[PDB]
Amino acid sequence: KNLRRIIRKGIHIIKKYG
């Protein structure tokens, strides 16, 4: 995909998990 890092950026949630 494109802007994947940007697309998921706005989301960046799974990263705030653990």
Elucidated via? NMR
Q: What is each CA distance from 12 to 5, 8, in whole angstroms? A: 9, 6
Distance from CA of residue 6 to its chain's centroid? 7
Cα 5 to the chain's mean position, in Å? 6
- Inter-CA distances, 4 with 9, 11, 12, 15, 16, Å: 8, 10, 11, 14, 17
